[PDB]
């Protein structure tokens, strides 16, 4: 069942590690773009103490699984086969579903309409990009006929996966910010500065 | 480009699908090997045509091995029922178990043969059955390879395919020689009924 999922006879991560430099460089540019969004999330969560704030806890744990996926597109990290990437997406979607519950509780107890709506829209983005990560995690690198050779291309699947993670990262940042704001207009979530 | 299909369900390109689109330079070397395999398989067709399969489990087993072996050579061309590497491996396993059963029956025929030369000839061919079954098992596990060349990661299935086919060709030749020799060693005193 491991050899069910090989591409051209090798593990998915091994294929990413052997992609031609041009593909690897296009992937690296997306990864660097991803690290900018991770920078915004690190700066936001570092404002808050994670005791009694599972939103912050879940944000950090979603971010750390996305880094495993980001590493996978470079042929590194713990995710070896497609099934591992799928399962990592699944964990992220679970954490997002838990973040969405907490966030909706905060929203319902908020009577500031514009703050309510902003929070709820960011929680839709969490759902959207958790789904997108699930979808993108099932797209394997592909084999293409080019000039009488069979060549491996994984750049498109890697970049779509990274792009979904970038967007999810941004949705988490907005959700953290908007959850704190909505709370100050009211709690299972304590917003203690660090 | 190789056909996408549902794999274990998400889209993927299976080993059989990859064989099916190998560059025609790779496919030409494989066809050459399959042609010489076909020659050996003819010789089995002629030999087992000459006999009735009732009570002759030697001949029953020989057509069983031939049919699975054709599934394997078809795989190297992107055809037949073996889709995944694990299918090629399990096909080699069932060939090996058939060969085990053929070896068993063969060795009892040999041990009841009073012509010493004919006994030894039969036993020699049975040794080839056992060696070539093991060797087909080995070759069934060889995967395609990828190599960074030309600024591309390029796929090649030539070497696993040719190795699989040469293994099946050796075993095919051993099986037909084993039938011819099982009968000869039977003449010297499993039913060898024609038609
Ligand atoms: Br390169
Ligand atoms: Br490219
Ligand atoms: Br609340
Ligand atoms: Br297929
Ligand atoms: Br054939």
Residue numbers in the entry:
A (entry chain A): 658 to 843, 855 to 862
B (entry chain B): 648 to 655, 663 to 843, 857 to 862
Describing publication, verbatim:
The cadherin-catenin cell adhesion complex is the major building block of AJs, and has a crucial function in the dynamic behaviors of epithelial cells, such as cell polarization and cell rearrangements. The structure of α-catenin (100 kDa) consists of three distinct domains. The C-terminal actin-binding domain (ABD) (28 kDa), which is connected to the rest by a flexible P-linker region28 (2 kDa), directly binds to F-actin, and closely resembles the vinculin ABD (vin-ABD).
The electron density map of α5-helix clearly shows that V796 adopts a conformation that exposes its side chain on the ABD surface, along with two additional hydrophobic residues L785 and I792. Our observations of the cryptic (attenuated) and exposed (activated) conformations of V796, despite the nearly identical primary sequences of αEcat- and αNcat-ABDs (87% identity), indicate that this residue resides within a conformationally dynamic region. Consistent with this idea, the αEcat-ABD-WT structure contains an internal cavity that could accommodate V796 in the cryptic state similar to V796N in the αNcat-ABD-WT structure. This internal cavity is partly formed by the side chain of M673 from α1-helix, hence raising the possibility that α1-helix unfolding allosterically affects the F-actin-binding site by changing the conformational dynamics of V796. The measurable reduction in F-actin binding with I792A or V796A suggests that I792 and V796 are likely involved in further stabilizing this interface, and any changes to these residues could modulate the F-actin-binding activity of αcat-ABD. These results confirm that the hydrophobic residues on the α5-helix surface constitute an important binding surface for F-actin interaction.
